Design a protein around this ligand. Structure first.
Ligand SMILES: CCCCC/C=C\C/C=C\C/C=C\C/C=C\CCCC(=O)O[C@H](COC(=O)CCCCCCCCCCCCCCC)COP(=O)(O)OCC[N+](C)(C)C
Length: 203
């Protein structure tokens, strides 16, 4: 990915930009808000996530976000996850546990972190994008996510936390049901965010 992309992801870290389209708020918990935008022609959603995470340093947060070995230990929604280098770049394989009776979703993607200093500010940017390799074909019974792009930008809130901004889009390869969106919004994601906070405490 080009440097532009790294500097572009930081754009809304300071002032969230949700006035361009119909961004509807989905969940507000642990000082984190998650907004979604629907594309009515396709049925697909985009997501943006902003807030702060008090009681977890920004540098350590960037570290737990890229530490897959640790991720597997504390995150109960990771079925399988491992990294490899293909052409000098880190390719990640990630299988997400979906609730019964839906199939699990798996991701093959490029991932790259850059620690910046813009306007004297410590910021950490993580970019992720969908790729394919012949050596890692599709698994029967696991939906391969073939369109997927994510950004994350971490910063200090000022006292003793991390200010964050994340953009997320994928095509999940099937009709994500309303009960699953409801489950994720009201239980899944809140429980995940607190598990993740706990994960900073025990690094
Ligand atoms: C900002 C820094 C603080 C940490 C991140 C903050 C907040 C993350 C929470 C939501 C982010 C917003 C929207 C994304 C919506 C769905 C995500 C899909 C499953 C997933 O991967 O989500 C984990 C997050 O884990 C979970 O929430 C576990 C609970 C869900 C697991 C199963 C869900 C089934 C499908 C749900 C569909 C409806 C979703 C509606 C959204 C409320 C992402 O983590 P990651 O950034 O490390 O990337 C992992 C690498 N990967 C993506 C390639 C697999």
């Amino acid at each position: 990915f080009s440097e532009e992309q790294f500097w572009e992801a930081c754009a809304e870290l300071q002032q969230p930009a949700l006035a361009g389209a119909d961004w509807q708020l989905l969940v507000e918990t642990s000082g984190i808000s998650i907004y979604r935008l629907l594309d009515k022609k396709t049925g697909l959603y985009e997501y943006k996530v902003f807030g702060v995470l008090e009681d977890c340093s920004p540098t350590l947060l960037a570290d737990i976000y890229m530490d897959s070995d640790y991720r597997k230990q504390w995150d109960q929604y990771v079925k399988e996850l491992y990294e490899q280098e293909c052409n000098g770049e880190t390719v990640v394989y990630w299988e997400v546990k979906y609730p019964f009776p839906m199939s699990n979703r798996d991701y093959v993607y490029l991932r790259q972190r850059r620690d910046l200093d813009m306007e004297g500010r410590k910021i950490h940017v993580i970019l992720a994008r969908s790729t394919s390799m012949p050596q890692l074909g599709e698994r029967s019974g696991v939906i391969r996510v073939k369109q997927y792009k994510q950004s994350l930008a971490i910063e200090s809130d000022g006292k003793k936390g991390s200010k964050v901004f994340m953009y997320y889009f994928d095509n999940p390869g099937g009709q994500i049901p309303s009960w699953l969106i409801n489950w994720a919004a009201k239980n899944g994601v809140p429980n995940f965010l607190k598990d993740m906070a706990r994960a900073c405490q025990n690094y």
